[PDB]
């Protein structure tokens, strides 16, 4: 697998047309609140392909 | 997209904005394609 290629599965909005986001910025899935720190309902948007 | 107009407006006032009529002519493109939601202008110093 060659993992060099990656993709935001997780973010708030969906962007407007011709519109780029290349920030690694964390999200919440839930209740709690990440604030930079990874843990329950928090995982990265970004995600490698096999 | 992006588009700029212009136009040397010739004046002789003294402080606000002058009194007639005059159109600004387009110049120049410039596709950034950003986001772009505030500019900020430049202010030149001197040294005595
Ligand atoms: C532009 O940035 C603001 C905050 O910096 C954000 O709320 C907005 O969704 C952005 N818009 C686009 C089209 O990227």
Redesign the interface.
Known sequence: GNYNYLYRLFRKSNLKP???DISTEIYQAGSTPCNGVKGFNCYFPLQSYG | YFKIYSKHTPINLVRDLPQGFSALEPLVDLPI???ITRFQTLLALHRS
């Open positions: 011709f519109e780029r | 394609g950003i986001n």
